[PDB]
Amino acid sequence: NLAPLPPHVPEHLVFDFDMYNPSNLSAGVQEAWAVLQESNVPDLVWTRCNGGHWIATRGQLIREAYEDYRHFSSECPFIPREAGEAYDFIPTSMDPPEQKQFRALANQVVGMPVVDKLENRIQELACSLIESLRPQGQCNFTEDYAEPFPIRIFMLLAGLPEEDIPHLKYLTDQMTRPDGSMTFAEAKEALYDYLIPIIEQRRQKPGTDAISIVANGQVNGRPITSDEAKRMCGLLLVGGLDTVVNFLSFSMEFLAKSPEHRQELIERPERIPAACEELLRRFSLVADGRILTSDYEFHGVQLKKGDQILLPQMLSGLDERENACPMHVDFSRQKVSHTTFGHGSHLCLGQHLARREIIVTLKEWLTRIPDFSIAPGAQIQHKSGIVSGVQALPLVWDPATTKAV
Numbered sequence: 001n002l003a004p005l006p007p008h009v010p011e012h013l014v015f016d017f018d019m020y021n022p023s024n025l026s027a028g029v030q031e032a033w034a035v036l037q038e039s040n041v042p043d044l045v046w047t048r049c050n051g052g053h054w055i056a057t058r059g060q061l062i063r064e065a066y067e068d069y070r071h072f073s074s075e076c077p078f079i080p081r082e083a084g085e086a087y088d089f090i091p092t093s094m095d096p097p098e099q100k101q102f103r104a105l106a107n108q109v110v111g112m113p114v115v116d117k118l119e120n121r122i123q124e125l126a127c128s129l130i131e132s133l134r135p136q137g138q139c140n141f142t143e144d145y146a147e148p149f150p151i152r153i154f155m156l157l158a159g160l161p162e163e164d165i166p167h168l169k170y171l172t173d174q175m176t177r178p179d180g181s182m183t184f185a186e187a188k189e190a191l192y193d194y195l196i197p198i199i200e201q202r203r204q205k206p207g208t209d210a211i212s213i214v215a216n217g218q219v220n221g222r223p224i225t226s227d228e229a230k231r232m233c234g235l236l237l238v239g240g241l242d243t244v245v246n247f248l249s250f251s252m253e254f255l256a257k258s259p260e261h262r263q264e265l266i267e268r269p270e271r272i273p274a275a276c277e278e279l280l281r282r283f284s285l286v287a288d289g290r291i292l293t294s295d296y297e298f299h300g301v302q303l304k305k306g307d308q309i310l311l312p313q314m315l316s317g318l319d320e321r322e323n324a325c326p327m328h329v330d331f332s333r334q335k336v337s338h339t340t341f342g343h344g345s346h347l348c349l350g351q352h353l354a355r356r357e358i359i360v361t362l363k364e365w366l367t368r369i370p371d372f373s374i375a376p377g378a379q380i381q382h383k384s385g386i387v388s389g390v391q392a393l394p395l396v397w398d399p400a401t402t403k404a405v
């Protein structure tokens, strides 16, 4: 389903890429998106899929656009337009200077100091989950670890019941990797139907949880409104439930296929942080965008007001002009360049929490289960969207080779 080409788009700039179903998906999602960086593809293209929109394919252009909020607004960040229009999360749907005040409050609940305080809990949960899995000699990583580990930590931070995970996770996924079962607007309404009663309660009887903090926070000198708190908590929910969850699976899938990389981290632990950065570059998984606030000539191409442009955060680090041999994983890269956590005024506030969860996982898993691989005959399938992911990851290992710690 290709939308008719708009009058202002030159035919030679057309490249019909479908971000929800790219062609080479079987080869891996990152590989599928990397076709946009082939020599035959211009730096800025227009796709007729998903309603029609531009796509910047180079790190330089992606960074530039994310810095210039004057022309590229966060008001409509999701594609298709219907989704971008229904999108109202704070502070991501706001441009500076308005965004700043809300960003400050959100930093209060997921910023560095909160991570420092939750450190021991993150460590305890990781160890507890792995030790319970260790003797079994097999598991579906996505559902046995990738999902429970980060999600339970978030539910703990937000003060929400574990029983609600299945429901909340389903809604979140519909927003990033649309099933077709429901529209973004409907998925958003349901999520808000869930939060409203809770925020109402936390406003009267405040706790120490993230939601209580947001609900009773202050912005621009005055108290936050119920609606504003709702829209911010909505964003925190999606970030906590559908980001680290998918990244862990991409990383573990790679480690399961590369004994040499596992060994490297086991023998030289001081390399884990650097390894984490390189994995974040190679397995980058986010791609959202901006909307043109007016007509603007960008690198020779004429963009029209209202035009939507996808600026794939995942593509910056795969760009060869930024990283030599981009598809190759090299823990000793002198320079790891990427925009996995974003760029510009909307730089990810939860990146400290994410890095902590990734590093703890790598260390604690390789400590107890140094040797593992993908189950024979299993075919790992990736899924594309605003946030990419892995369908399932069956792993197997010899319990005799594990170490109880």
Ligand code: HEM
Pocket: 077, 090, 091, 092, 093, 099, 103, 106, 110, 235, 236, 237, 238, 239, 240, 241, 243, 244, 247, 285, 286, 288, 289, 313, 339, 340, 341, 342, 343, 345, 346, 347, 348, 349, 350, 351, 353, 354
């Ligand atoms: C590895 C996982 C993660 C990745 C790759 C990631 C990526 C991103 C990206 C690319 C943005 C910018 C979006 C844009 O500019 O339109 C962003 C924003 C944000 N992320 Fe993360 N994120 C991750 C984990 C988290 C977590 C765990 C949370 C916490 C619940 C979270 C909270 C936020 C917030 C609050 C923003 C909005 C900041 C603002 O608009 O000022 N993220 N993230």
Ligand SMILES: CC1(C)[C@@H]2CC[C@@]1(C)C(=O)C2
Pocket: 089, 092, 176, 235, 238, 239, 243, 286, 287, 288, 386, 387
């Ligand atoms: C693009 C994101 C990864 C970022 C945090 C959750 C997300 C889906 C948003 O809507 C903003």
